[PDB]
Amino acid sequence: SIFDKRVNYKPFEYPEVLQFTEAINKAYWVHTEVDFTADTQDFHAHLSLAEKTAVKNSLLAIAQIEVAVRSFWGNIYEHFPKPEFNGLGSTFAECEFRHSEAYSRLLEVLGYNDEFEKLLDVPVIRRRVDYLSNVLKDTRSQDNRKYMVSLILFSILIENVSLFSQFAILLSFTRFKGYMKNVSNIIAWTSIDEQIHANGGIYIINKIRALVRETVKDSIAVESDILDWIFEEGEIESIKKGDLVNFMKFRIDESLKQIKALAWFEEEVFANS
């Protein structure tokens, strides 16, 4: 089975894994390629306080997940002891380190390290953490039935929902205003990697073939409250909170179908890619 340890390296029992690692390989990128001087000039002079807050809080919401020690992918070999899944996890774990460094830099160049330190003082961020830490309680569980339960939640929200909300907000400043072009480059490259991390999760879930889908509907409530915190200074004009909820509803449905004025998102991602 997939939970049994195969000793020989090749042939790969699941050769489709290379499609996900090679996609990460071809999309390889680091934050040191990008210069944020123009974005700081656009930020300082041409963005309203409600627009500054939307950029600040969206990046803080992204950093809450991205700026952390990521250990799920780097340990799937402990649960799927195959050489191809150790490489799948290795490639995703490295990519998450490039992500954590990129949003650690953005927090530094925009001067938001202090707010990131005390981020749990925000009640709604504290609500997403209490949510996330509990629903993913069995990511390290030796029980192979509730570890699967973790990979479902990990792939459709951590990789598909809990971040693409803030990706579209930041990309809207480049789409409709032509601002934050370099930050949107980091955002476009990140969302591409998270799309591959989601498909890799979806791919595995289909290979292991109630508690799930009404656990994930609980996140739409907390993710909607996060948008209230992101737009606490007022709704900006490039995007609206109501459309982002439907964008969140669209992505969850297509995630489960394989196991909208925000249709421009995919087009905007490849333009800034």
The annotated binding site for Mg(2+) is made up of 75
**Position 32 contacts its own copies (CB under 8 A):** yes
By CB under 8 A, the residues from 75 to 104 that bind its own copies are: 77, 83, 86-87, 89-91, 93-94, 96-98, 100-101, 104
Bond from prior residue into 15 cis (ω within 30 degrees of 0): no
Which is closer to its own copies, CB of 47 or CB of 95? Answer: 95
Structure tokens at 256: 């489960």
**Position 194 contacts Mn ion (CB under 5 A):** yes
By CB under 5 A, the residues from 53 to 92 that bind Mn ion are: 66
Among its own copies, Mn ion, none, residue 120 binds (CB under 5-8 Å by kind): none
Are residues 254 and 191 in contact, defined by beta-carbon separation less than 8 angstroms? no
How many alpha carbons lie under 13 Å from residue 223 in its C-beta half-sphere?
26
Report the nearest approach of Mn ion to the CB of residue 47 (Å): 25
- Residue selected from 79, 99, 128, 175 as contacting Mn ion according to rule CB under 5 A: 99
By CB under 8 A, the residues from 112 to 151 that bind its own copies are: 113, 117
Among its own copies, Mn ion, none, residue 94 binds (CB under 5-8 Å by kind): its own copies
Among Mn ion, its own copies, none, residue 194 binds (CB under 5-8 Å by kind): Mn ion
By CB under 5 A, the residues from 196 to 215 that bind Mn ion are: 197
By CB under 8 A, the residues from 233 to 272 that bind its own copies are: none
Question: How far is 110 from 113, CA to CA, in rounded Å?
Answer: 9
Find where tokens 């939640």 sit.
153
Among its own copies, Mn ion, none, residue 99 binds (CB under 5-8 Å by kind): Mn ion
Among its own copies, Mn ion, none, residue 118 binds (CB under 5-8 Å by kind): none
Q: Would you give the end-to-end CA distance of the chain in angstroms? A: 38
Report the nearest approach of Mn ion to the CB of residue 5 (Å): 22
What is the pattern of x (binds Mn ion, CB under 5 A) and - over residues 113-132? --------------------
Among Mn ion, its own copies, none, residue 71 binds (CB under 5-8 Å by kind): its own copies
Which is closer to Mn ion, CB of 66 or CB of 84? Answer: 66
Question: How far is 109 from 107, CA to CA, in rounded Å?
Answer: 6
Neighbour tally for 45: CB within 10 Å: 7
Site residues for its own copies per CB under 8 A: 8-10, 18, 21-22, 25, 28, 30, 32, 67-71, 74, 77, 83, 86-87, 89-91, 93-94, 96-98, 100-101, 104, 113, 117
Site residues for Mn ion per CB under 5 A: 66, 96, 99, 159, 194, 197
